[PDB]
Amino acid sequence: MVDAFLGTWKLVDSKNFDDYMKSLGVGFATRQVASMTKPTTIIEKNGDILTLKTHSTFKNTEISFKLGVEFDETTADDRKVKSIVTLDGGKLVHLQKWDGQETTLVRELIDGKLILTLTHGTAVCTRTYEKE
Ligand SMILES: O=S(=O)(O)c1cccc2cccc(Nc3ccccc3)c12
């Protein structure tokens, strides 16, 4: 259920984020900033339009979209992508494509926590957020 995602979530743990960002082109200077940072993800719905915002001292982004309906997105790291977000049995699956490249962001609730798995080819990163 989408509804179970809604609310504000605060990053508490991060695993292999640096390699994920490097895998995407994020430069060293910026990786150092982003990694010590502890972002908030806010997930909202308004009818059948979801909005996911990322709030932090590094960057601030927001996306709004319908599930299964493809959309343009400019990412935190300034990639210009084609995105699609679907719901695969409680798992929010965010697929991005740009320049023949693909990355996936999977969001699932485990133990009252929101676990985001980021995958870019072989670079995999897991980021755990606590409900606020
Ligand atoms: O986290 S995400 O927006 O998912 C994100 C996803 C994919 C690539 C990212 C690259 C740099 C920073 C991010 N965000 C970020 C925002 C605030 C603090 C630290 C990193 C990236």
Residue numbers in the entry: 0 to 131
From the paper:
Heart-type fatty-acid-binding protein (FABP3), which is a cytosolic protein abundantly found in cardiomyocytes, plays a role in trafficking fatty acids throughout cellular compartments by reversibly binding intracellular fatty acids with relatively high affinity. Each FABP has its own sequence, shows 22–73% similarity in amino acid sequence, and exhibits distinct ligand preferences, although all of the FABPs share a common structure consisting of ten antiparallel β-strands that are capped by a pair of α-helices. The fluorescent probe 1-anilinonaphthalene-8-sulfonate (ANS) is extensively utilized for examining the interaction of ligands with fatty-acid-binding proteins.
We solved the crystal structure of hFABP3 in complex with ANS at 2.15 Å resolution. The crystal contains four identical hFABP3 molecules in an asymmetric unit. An important feature is that ANS is located in the middle part of the binding cavity lined with a cluster of hydrophobic side-chains. The structure clarified four water molecules in the binding cavity of hFABP3, and through these water molecules the bound ANS molecule forms a hydrogen-bonding network with the side-chains of Thr40, Thr53, Arg106, Arg126 and Tyr128. Indeed, the sulfonate group of ANS is positioned far away from Arg126 (6.4 Å) and Tyr128 (6.5 Å) so that their direct interaction is highly unlikely in the hFABP3–ANS complex. Furthermore, our analysis revealed that the orientation of ANS binding to hFABP3 is opposite to that of ANS binding to mFABP4.
